[PDB]
Amino acid sequence: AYARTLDRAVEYLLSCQKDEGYWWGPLLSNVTMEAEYVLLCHILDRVDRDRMEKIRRYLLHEQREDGTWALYPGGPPDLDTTIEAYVALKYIGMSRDEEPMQKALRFIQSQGGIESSRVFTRMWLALVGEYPWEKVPMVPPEIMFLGKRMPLNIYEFGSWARATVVALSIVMSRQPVFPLPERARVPELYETDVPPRRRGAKGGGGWIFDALDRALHGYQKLSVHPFRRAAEIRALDWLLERQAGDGSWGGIQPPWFYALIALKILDMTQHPAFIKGWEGLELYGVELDYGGWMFQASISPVWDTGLAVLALRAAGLPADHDRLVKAGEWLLDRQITVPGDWAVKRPNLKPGGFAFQFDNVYYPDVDDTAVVVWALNTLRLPDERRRRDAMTKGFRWIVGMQSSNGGWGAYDVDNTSDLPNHIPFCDFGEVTDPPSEDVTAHVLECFGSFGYDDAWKVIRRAVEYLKREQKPDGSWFGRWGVNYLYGTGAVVSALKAVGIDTREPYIQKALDWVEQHQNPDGGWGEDCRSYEDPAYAGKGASTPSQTAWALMALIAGGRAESEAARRGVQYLVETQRPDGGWDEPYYTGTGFPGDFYLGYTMYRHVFPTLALGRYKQAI
Amino acid sequence: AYARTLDRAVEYLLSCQKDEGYWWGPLLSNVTMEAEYVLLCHILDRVDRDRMEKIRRYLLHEQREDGTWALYPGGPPDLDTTIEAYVALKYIGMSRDEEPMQKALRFIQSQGGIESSRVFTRMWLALVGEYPWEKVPMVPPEIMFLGKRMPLNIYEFGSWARATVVALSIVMSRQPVFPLPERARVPELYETDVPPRRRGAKGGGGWIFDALDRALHGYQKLSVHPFRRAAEIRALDWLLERQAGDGSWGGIQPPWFYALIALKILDMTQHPAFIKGWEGLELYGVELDYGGWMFQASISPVWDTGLAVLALRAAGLPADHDRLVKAGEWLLDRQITVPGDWAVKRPNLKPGGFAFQFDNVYYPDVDDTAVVVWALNTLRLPDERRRRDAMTKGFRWIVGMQSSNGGWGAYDVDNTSDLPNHIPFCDFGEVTDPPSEDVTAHVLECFGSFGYDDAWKVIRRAVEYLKREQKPDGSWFGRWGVNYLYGTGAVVSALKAVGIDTREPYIQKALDWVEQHQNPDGGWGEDCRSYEDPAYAGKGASTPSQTAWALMALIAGGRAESEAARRGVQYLVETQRPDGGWDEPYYTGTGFPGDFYLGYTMYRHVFPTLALGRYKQAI
Ligand SMILES: C=CCN(C)CCCCCCOc1ccc2c(-c3ccc(Br)cc3)nccc2c1
Ligand SMILES: C=CCN(C)CCCCCCOc1ccc2c(-c3ccc(Br)cc3)nccc2c1
Ligand SMILES: CCCCCCCCOCCOCCOCCOCCO
Ligand SMILES: CCCCCCCCOCCOCCOCCOCCO
Numbered sequence A, B: 001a002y003a004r005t006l007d008r009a010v011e012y013l014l015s016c017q018k019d020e021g022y023w024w025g026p027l028l029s030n031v032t033m034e035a036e037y038v039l040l041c042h043i044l045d046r047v048d049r050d051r052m053e054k055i056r057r058y059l060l061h062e063q064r065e066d067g068t069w070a071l072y073p074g075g076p077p078d079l080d081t082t083i084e085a086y087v088a089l090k091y092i093g094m095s096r097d098e099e100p101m102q103k104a105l106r107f108i109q110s111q112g113g114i115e116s117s118r119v120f121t122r123m124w125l126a127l128v129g130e131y132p133w134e135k136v137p138m139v140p141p142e143i144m145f146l147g148k149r150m151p152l153n154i155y156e157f158g159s160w161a162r163a164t165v166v167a168l169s170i171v172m173s174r175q176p177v178f179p180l181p182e183r184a185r186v187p188e189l190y191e192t193d194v195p196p197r198r199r200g201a202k203g204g205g206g207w208i209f210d211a212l213d214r215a216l217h218g219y220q221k222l223s224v225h226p227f228r229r230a231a232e233i234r235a236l237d238w239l240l241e242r243q244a245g246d247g248s249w250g251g252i253q254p255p256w257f258y259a260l261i262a263l264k265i266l267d268m269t270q271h272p273a274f275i276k277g278w279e280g281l282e283l284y285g286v287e288l289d290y291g292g293w294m295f296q297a298s299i300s301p302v303w304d305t306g307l308a309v310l311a312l313r314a315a316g317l318p319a320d321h322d323r324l325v326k327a328g329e330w331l332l333d334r335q336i337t338v339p340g341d342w343a344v345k346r347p348n349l350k351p352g353g354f355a356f357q358f359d360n361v362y363y364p365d366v367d368d369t370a371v372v373v374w375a376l377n378t379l380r381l382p383d384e385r386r387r388r389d390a391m392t393k394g395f396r397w398i399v400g401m402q403s404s405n406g407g408w409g410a411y412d413v414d415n416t417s418d419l420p421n422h423i424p425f426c427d428f429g430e431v432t433d434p435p436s437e438d439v440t441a442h443v444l445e446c447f448g449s450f451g452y453d454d455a456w457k458v459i460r461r462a463v464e465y466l467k468r469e470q471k472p473d474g475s476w477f478g479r480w481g482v483n484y485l486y487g488t489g490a491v492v493s494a495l496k497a498v499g500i501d502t503r504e505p506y507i508q509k510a511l512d513w514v515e516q517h518q519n520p521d522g523g524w525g526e527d528c529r530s531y532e533d534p535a536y537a538g539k540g541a542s543t544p545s546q547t548a549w550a551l552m553a554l555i556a557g558g559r560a561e562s563e564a565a566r567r568g569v570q571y572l573v574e575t576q577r578p579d580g581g582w583d584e585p586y587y588t589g590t591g592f593p594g595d596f597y598l599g600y601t602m603y604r605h606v607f608p609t610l611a612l613g614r615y616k617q618a619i
Helices: A002-016 A032-043 A049-062 A079-092 A101-110 A121-128 A141-144 A159-174 A207-221 A227-241 A253-265 A272-284 A301-315 A321-332 A341-345 A364-377 A384-401 A437-451 A457-471 A484-497 A505-515 A543-554 A563-575 A603-616 B003-014 B032-043 B049-062 B079-092 B099-109 B119-127 B140-145 B159-174 B209-221 B227-242 B255-267 B273-285 B300-313 B323-330 B368-374 B384-401 B436-451 B457-469 B485-498 B504-516 B544-556 B561-574 B601-615
Strands: A286-288 A292-295 A589-592 A596-600 B286-287 B293-295 B589-592 B596-600
Touching: A002 A563, A032 A049, A032 A079, A032 A121, A032 A292, A049 A079, A049 A286, A049 B079, A079 A101, A079 A121, A121 B079, A141 A159, A141 A227, A159 A227, A159 A253, A207 B589, A227 A253, A227 B227, A253 A272, A253 A589, A253 B457, A272 A286, A272 B273, A301 A321, A301 A364, A301 A603, A321 A364, A321 A384, A364 A384, A364 A437, A384 A437, A437 A457, A457 A484, A484 A505, A484 A543, A505 A543, A543 A563, A543 A603, A563 A603, A596 A603, A603 B209, B003 B300, B003 B601, B032 B049, B032 B079, B032 B119, B032 B293, B032 B436, B049 B079, B049 B293, B079 B099, B079 B119, B079 B227, B119 B293, B140 B159, B140 B227, B159 B227, B159 B255, B227 B255, B255 B273, B273 B286, B300 B323, B300 B368, B300 B601, B323 B384, B368 B384, B368 B436, B384 B436, B436 B457, B436 B485, B457 B485, B485 B544, B504 B544, B544 B601, B561 B601
Parallel strands: none
Antiparallel strands: A286 A292, A589 A596, B286 B293, B589 B596
C-alpha cells in the first residue's frame, strides 16, 4: 500500500538535495520583511528601481481581496503588517487612490490608525519622519553599562532581542530622521476618529516603567549626557565583535537591519562590517517565479538537512547511503567550536553545538544541536573518528545547557527573567528564552537514540519537567511549531525514546487527545488561531505535516494498528502529489505565539516521509 | 633640444595611466616582507605550495653574490634581513648545505647570530618557537588603559607604531608558539662565538625601562592578572573599529600581519574581519616576470596619481585635457570625509584629507593631502562646484594640522613626545611622527599655488621653522626621500612658491650646495648611506629622480641659465630610454632614516618630466 507512497517521497526528497549535500527550503513569514527592506534601502540611499518592482508585485500578490495582509495565510488582517505594506507600496510609487491602497487605508483607519501599531512599526515610521520620536519607547545606549547581575542587563534578554536592543540603543541614542519625498508622506495614517487602541508590553505596564521611559525621553532633551559617547562605543564594539560570517547579525532579519542603520548613523559606511553587512543580504532574498522577490526572516539549511536525513533513514535508506554520507559530512563541517554568548552563563562548557543558518558561530541552539547530533548518530561516515568525536562534543554541550527546571531553552540557560517583559518597548513577540516542551523533547529523543534512559538523572529531571507541563486535556504546547499537535507529537515521540512506558496514564490521556481531533478527511490540522483562542486546539484544516506529527504520537504510543492511525496513513497516501511531494498552504511553524508565524517549506515533505517510515517500521 | 625628450616622457607617462584614471607603480622595499609573509602563512596554516615557489624564486633573485640581502640595492649586508630570508628559504625547502644557504649562515654567524637581530626579528622567531619569549621586550595589553594625557598612552606613538603596538599587545599577552616542522628548525642561528652585539632602543636605555620590562616579564609569570581580559578586549575593539576597507590596517604591512595573528590568537578565524583581512592581502602582492612574487610594504596610488598630474601639467598638457580630467575626478572620490585618529588632538577640525593608498579613511596624511589638493588646483573639471569644495575642505584640514613649531608632521599634530623612543621594544625605525622639512615644504608649495604668501601668519611660522632647520652647509634633510637633495630640492622649490626672495643669503647658500655636488656625468645622485655617514651627503651614483630634484632647486632659485642647470638637463636627455622612460636601479625614497628604504617605481619617470617642464617653463 503506502509502500509506493514512501518510495515516491524518498526519490523526491533525494531530488531536492543540493550538490554540496544539504537541503534548504525557503522560510516563509509575513510582508513586514520586504516592507522594512524597502524602507532600509531608502535610509541607506540604495534603491534599485528594478528590485522595488519585484517587491511591488510581491506585496500586491500577497494582499487579500479585502485589501489587508496577515501574519499567516488564511489569517485575520494584521494592522501592523498592513500599515507597513501600505507605506512600502506608496513609496515604491502607487498613489493613495488605487483600489489596493484604498481598501488597505480603510482597514487601517477602522482600527485607530498608526496609533494602534506596535512599537517597531511606529519606530520605522519615526525613522523616515512620519511619526514623532518622542512617542517611541526609549532604550538608551547606557543599557550597555548594566553588568552580568543586574536588572535589565542585556543578557537578561533572549538572544534575538539582545542584539536588536544593542543595535537600537545606538539608533534611539541619536534619533535620526531620513525624510521621505513628498509624494510618499503618509499623513492619512492619522486621519481617523476610531479611538487609538494602544497595545501594551507583553507583561503589563507597571507605572515605574512609564515613569522611567518618561524620564529617559526627558534626559534625551538635555544638552549634555555624560558618558553617552562611551555607552555608544560599547554598543558598537558589542556589535562588531559578534557580526556573523555571512555579514548578518544572528542570522535574523531584525538586528541585521538595525545594525546596518546604526553603522550608517555612525558614518561608517566605508567600513568592512558595513560592506559585508550590506552585500550579505542577497543570500537571504528569493526570486519568485511570478516576477516577485521576497526576503527571508531567516534561513534554515542546517535544520532542513538534519530532518531530511532523519526522515530518509526512518524511511529506509542505509546508514551509509552515499547520498546521506554527503549530508553527514557537510553537517560535520558545521559544528561550532568557539564560545558564544551562551558561555556567559557557562564559562567552563566545551562548545560543540550547531546553528540554524549556514554560518552563525555565536548563536548555536539546542534544537538544531539535538537534531543534528541525533541525525549523525544514525549514519556511518568514512571518518568514524570524527563522527564519534563531533557527537561527543555536541552531546556534552547539550547536557551542559540543561536549565534549572530540567528543561532546555533554545539559546541560553535560565534565560527566565521576568523583568524584560514589562518595559514599554517590548510589545511584540517573546523577549526572553525560557525552556520549552518541544526543545526538551527533541533533546530527550536525541539522547534516547544513544540508549540513555530514565535511570540517568538528566533525563529524569526533564521528564519531571515535561510532566508538570502537560495541559489538563493531555496535550503539550507547541513553542516553535503549530501547536498542540506539534508539542504532543514531540513529547510522546521522545518519552517513548527514553524508555518510559507508553502505557502510563498521562501518555494515554495524550494519545487519546490526538485521536479526538482527527478531522473527517482522515488527517489532522491545527490553525494558528490556537495561540489566540483555545477553541482551536487540535482544530484546523488538515495539513501533511501536522498529520505526520499526530501519526508519530500514535506510532510511538503503540496505537499503530488503531483506525485513526490507518486513516491518517490513508490521508498522506491519497493527498501525495504525482512527483512525491505534498502541498501545504498553511503555516505549521511558530516564530512567537500570537505574533509571528513561519512556513517551513520542507516540513510538508520531510515529516510525512518520516511518519510513514515509522509506520512501516512498526510492522 | 629637450623638447623631444619631454614629448616622449609625456606620451610615456600617459601610457602608464590605468583606465579608471590613476597611476600606480609598485613600491619596493626589502625581503623581510616576503619572508614574514611566509611565516605568517605558516602561523595561519595556509601555505600555498605554488606561492612558496614564486617566493623562493624572488628571495634567491635578491640575494647578492656574497650570500646576503640588503635594505637597498648596492647596500651593506643586513643582519636582520638576511636572518629572516634564511629562515624563510629553509622553511620553503632548501637545506642548510646549499651554496646560497651556506654563504648566508656565514654572514649571520660572523655577526653574533640571532642575538644581534632587532626585536621584530627575534619576535617572529619567538612566534614559531625558535627563540625564548622571555628575551623579547614586552608590550602589555594594559597599555590600552593609559588615557589621552599620560606617559606612553597609545596616541603618543606615531600612527604606524600605534596600530602595531595595539596589535602586538594581544599577541605578547598570550605569547603563543606555532612550532616549525623539524626540517626547518634553525638552531644554527645560535652557533657562533662572536659576542652578541645587541641593538638598543632608538634613544637609549634608561635603566627605568629595563626595570619596567623585567617587571612586566615577571608579571607575565603570575597565575592571574586582574583586568587583563578587559585590556585585551580593549585592543581587539580598537582594532575592529579601525580596519581599512581593503581589509588591511593602516594600509601598511606590519600591523596588518600582527592583527591577523592576534585574531587567529583569539580564535576568530571565521569572523568577517579576519576573512576580509586575509583576502585583502592579494591586492598588495605582485607577480614578477621572472617567475617570482613580492609583497608591497604598502601601495601608493594616490601619491602616484597626484604627482603624475602635477608633472604632466608643468610639462604642458591643458588644465582640461581629457586624461588629466579622469585623474582629477578619481582624486575627488578619494577625499576622506570622516574623522580619523588625528581628530583626537583636533576634535573641531572638519575632515578633508587624503591617503597614500586606495581606501584608508582613518589615516590621511599631510603630504598626500597637500599634493592632491595642489594638483586639483591646476585642473579644470566639469563639476567646478566639487573641485572648488574639495580643495577648500582639504586646504582647511591641512591648516588645522599645522604643529606647534610651525612645521607639519605626516599623520598627527605635535606627535613630538620623546618618551616612546626609549622603551626596549623600539629598536627599529621611527616611532613618533614629529614635523619634517619636506612635508612642510610641500604644504607650503601647495598654498603658494593658490597665491598665499609671506604675509599670512601660517606661512610665516613655517618659513621660520624651515630656517631654524637648515643645515650648516645650507642643505635640508630628507625624511621621506633620499636625502639632502630631496629636502633641499623641496624647500627651495617651496620658498620660491610662497613669494620669498630667491636672492636671500640662505637660499643662495643652499642653491650653491646643489651645484657643489653635481657628478661628473652632469647629473646628481645621493646614496642611502647618507643617513649613516655624512661623507655621503649629496654623493652617489646619478639617478634620474635625484637629478630632477636638484634641477628644481636650481630652477626655483633662478639659476636656470647656469651651466650646472644645462648640464643636468643634458643628463636627463641623454639617459632617457627610447620609449620615454628612465631607469633607476637605486632607491630614492625613505621609510625611516637608517632602517628602511623604499623604491617608488614612478619617481624615475614623473620627476624628470616635472623638472623638464619647469625648465621649459623658464624660457
Ligand atoms: C525549530 C527549530 C529552529 N529554531 C532555531 C527556531 C527557528 C526560529 C528562528 C527564526 C525566527 O527568528 C526571529 C527572531 C526574532 C524576530 C523578531 C524580533 C521580535 C522582538 C524583538 Br525585541 C527582536 C526581534 N521580529 C520579527 C522576526 C523575528 C524572527
Ligand atoms: C611620501 C609621501 C607618502 N607618505 C604617506 C609616506 C609613505 C610611507 C608609508 C609607507 C611605509 O609604511 C611603513 C610604516 C611602518 C613600517 C614599519 C614599522 C617600524 C616600527 C614600528 Br613600532 C611599526 C612599523 N616596519 C616596516 C615597514 C614599514 C612601512
Ligand atoms: C576578546 C578577549 C578574549 C576573550 C576570550 C573568549 C572568551 C569570551 O567570553 C565568552 C562570553 O562573551 C560573549 C561572546 O563571545 C563572542 C564574541 O566575542 C569574541 C572575542 O572573544
Ligand atoms: C563611536 C561613537 C563615537 C562617534 C564619534 C566619532 C568620533 C570618532 O573619533 C575619532 C578618533 O578616534 C579614532 C578613530 O575613529 C575611527 C573609528 O571609530 C569609528 C566610530 O566612530
